[PDB]
């Protein structure tokens, strides 16, 4: 029920420009004699010119990488060069920039090597790619470009009766669209890697089809090789729960799950029936706070108490006091919108000091709804390499701990 569907992305490393300028230097010596009179002269001729029409050549440094569950033989992408809300050229790479092999979970070329270069737009490798003069002025005035993937073309492998395989005329292109008509797209993002899978779905409109269906918790169990450990789900001894990760929905999927939850009797987003067209992100968190064990924390909290520190639904202490952790910015990445999220309890008042500079130094009271558990989450911006700490502090009157709290990445967020 998982379909082999290899994803390709193109990554930018460096950009080199080059100017088509034209220089010259001439020296002349003249002498004349006439009958008495004479003359002698020394002439210099410096010359510099540039003629528009192919006025600036360029070259780019790229590297291919795979993600998914297939190889991809003879991969060939296409790139679309933007400069400033616009386009400049569109290149399908020639024979010299073909990507030969690509194992799943890998890059091309191999890791201990240098990147790939591309410079021409013709079908045979001639005629270096030009940039006209106004784009050159926009470039030197301070504006920079990026890269963009649009499609790839590659071939799979299949063995005949003869005992070998053949890779010719077997395009992966005409197996793209069919899969994206039937499947749901689930992506995972951990701290170093990312994985994109398509899992098959079940249409409820027409009754003739018989496709076996499941739920999103079982879907993440089946797509990734996930081990059910004691009710939790674990992926390479990394916990993935309905509570220990951060889920991201787009608006149509969010609305479908949200209005489908009300007829359901359980308030879990792991037991919802899977639908046809979805995009579900699951991001792992950076720093976890299970007070029992597995707490990747540099310093340890204050006024803690171990009575059923199981995480959610059993955090079992209601007293007064203070918790505080100071952390410098040196360990974490700068200039990234970090998101801090945890859960609730039954106190009456609690307040949260998040004193991080260049960011939300607003501190608010808790506004606890009831003894039942609800999440809470705030956003902030990371500064640049300061031992001046971010210091989380929670003062409470009616609780000392609730055993779920974390901070996580929320990437694709730089500042300058």
Which residue ranges are tagged as binding site for Ca(2+)? Answer: 290, 292, 313, 315, 403
Residue 147's SS3 state is coil
Q: How far is the CB of 114 from a second copy (least distance, A)?
A: 5
Does 306 contact a second copy by CB under 8 A?
no
Rounded Cα gap, residues 94 and 71, in angstroms: 21
3-state secondary structure of 203: coil
374 burial level (CB within 10 Å; 0-12, 13-18, 19+): exposed
- When the beta carbons of 222 and 336 are compared against a second copy, the nearer one is 222
165 binds a second copy (CB under 8 A): yes
* 161 in contact with a second copy (CB under 8 A): no
The answer to the question of residue 204 lying near a second copy (CB under 8 A) is no
Site string for a second copy, 84-113 (x = CB under 8 A): -xxxxxxxx-xxxxx-xx-x-----x---x
Stretch that binds a second copy, among 14-22, 258-266, 337-345, 370-378 (CB under 8 A): 14-22
d(CA 62, CA 282): 28
Among 1, 105, 137, 157, binds a second copy (CB under 8 A): 157
At closest approach, how far in Å is the CB of 240 from a second copy?
A: 20
Other CB atoms within 10 A of residue 8 CB: 22
Would you say 20 or 271 has its CB closer to a second copy?
20
Tokens of 255: 């609305």
| Total of residues contacting a second copy (CB under 8 A) | 98
Minimum CB separation of residue 156 from a second copy in Å reads: 10
Separation CA 361–CA 344 (nearest Å): 21
Q: Is residue 237 a contact point for a second copy (CB under 8 A)?
A: no
Task: Tell me, residue by residue from 166 to 195, as one string, x for binding to a second copy by CB under 8 A and - for no binding.
Answer: xxxxxx-xxxxx--xx--------------
Q: Any residues with CB less than 8 A from the CB of 100 and at least 6 apart, and which?
A: 73, 74, 75, 108
Q: Are 291 and 402 in contact (CB under 8 A)?
A: no
In the complex with a second copy, which residue's Cβ is closer, 40 or 412? Answer: 40
3-state secondary structure 290-344: CCCCCCCCCCCCCCCCCCCCCCCCCCCECCEEEEEEEECHHHCCCCCCEEEEECC
d(CA 339, CA 247): 12
Residues 114-133 that bind a second copy (CB under 8 A): 114-119, 121-127, 132
Nearer to a second copy, 143 or 258 (CB): 143
| C-alpha gyration radius of the chain | 31
Could you give the CA distance from residue 394 to residue 350 in angstroms, rounded to a whole number? 7
CB of 283 to a second copy, least distance (A): 27
Q: Tell whether residue 144 is a contact of a second copy (CB under 8 A).
A: no
Q: What is the DSSP-derived secondary structure letter of residue 52?
A: S
Q: Would you count residue 203 as binding a second copy (CB under 8 A)?
A: no
Residues numbered 52 to 81 that lie near a second copy (CB under 8 A) are 52-54, 57, 61, 71, 73-74, 78, 80
**Residue ranges for the binding site?**
290, 292, 313, 315, 403
Contact 129, 91 (CB under 8 A): yes
Query: Smallest gap, in angstroms, from Cβ of residue 208 to a second copy?
Result: 39
State in angstroms the smallest separation of the CB of 173 from a second copy: 6
Shortest distance (Å) from residue 84 CB to a second copy:
11
Q: Are the C-beta atoms of residues 368 and 362 closer than 8 Å to each other?
A: no
- Looking at 1, 11, 14, 258, which residue binds a second copy (CB under 8 A)? 14
**Exposed/middle/buried for residue 315 (C-beta within 10 Å: 0-12, 13-18, 19+):** buried
**Choice between 31 and 367, CB closer to a second copy:** 31
């Amino acid at each position: 029920l998982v379909a082999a569907y290899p994803i390709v992305g193109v990554g930018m490393e460096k950009l080199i420009i080059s100017t088509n300028e034209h220089a010259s230097t001439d020296q002349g010596k003249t002498v004349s004699r006439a009958t008495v009179q004479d003359s002698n002269g020394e002439s210099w001729n410096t010359g510099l010119s540039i003629n528009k029409g192919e006025s600036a050549y360029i070259n780019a440094n790229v590297r291919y990488y795979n993600t998914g569950t297939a190889p991809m033989y003879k991969v060939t992408p296409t790139t679309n060069l933007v400069l400033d809300g616009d386009t400049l050229s569109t290149i399908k790479a020639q024979e010299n920039q073909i990507g030969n092999n690509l194992s799943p979970g890998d890059t091309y070329p191999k890791k201990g090597l240098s990147p790939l270069a591309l410079n021409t737009m013709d079908q045979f490798s001639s005629r270096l790619i030009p940039i006209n003069y106004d784009q050159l002025k926009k470039l030197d005035a301070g504006k920079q470009i990026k890269l963009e993937t649009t499609q790839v073309s590659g071939n799979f492998g299949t063995k005949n009766s003869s005992g070998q395989i053949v890779t010719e005329g077997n395009s992966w292109s005409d197996y793209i669209s069919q899969i994206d008509s039937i499947s749901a797209s689930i992506i995972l993002d951990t701290e170093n890697e990312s994985y994109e899978r398509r899992v098959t779905a079940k249409n409820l409109q027409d009754p003739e089809d018989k496709t076996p269906e499941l739920t999103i918790g079982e879907a993440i169990e089946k797509a990734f090789g996930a081990t059910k450990k004691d009710g939790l789900l674990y992926f390479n001894d990394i916990p993935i729960d309905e509570s220990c990760v951060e889920l991201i929905f787009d608006d149509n999927t969010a609305n479908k799950i949200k209005d489908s939850l009300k007829t359901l009797s359980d308030k879990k987003i792991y037991n919802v029936k899977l639908e046809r067209g979805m995009n579900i992100l699951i991001k792992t968190p950076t720093y976890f706070t299970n007070f029992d064990d597995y707490n990747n924390y540099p310093s340890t909290w204050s006024n803690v108490n171990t009575t059923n520190q199981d995480g959610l639904q059993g955090s079992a202490n209601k007293l007064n006091g203070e918790t505080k952790i100071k952390i410098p910015m040196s360990e974490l990445k700068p200039y990234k919108r970090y998101v801090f999220s945890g859960y609730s309890k039954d106190p009456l008042t609690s307040n949260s000091i998040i004193v991080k500079i260049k960011a939300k130094e607003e501190k608010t009271d808790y506004l606890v709804p009831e003894q039942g558990y609800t999440k809470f989450s705030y956003e902030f911006e990371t500064t640049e390499k300061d031992s001046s700490n971010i210091e989380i502090t929670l003062i409470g009157s009616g609780t000392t701990y609730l055993d779920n709290l974390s901070i996580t990445e929320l990437n694709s967020t730089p500042e300058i």
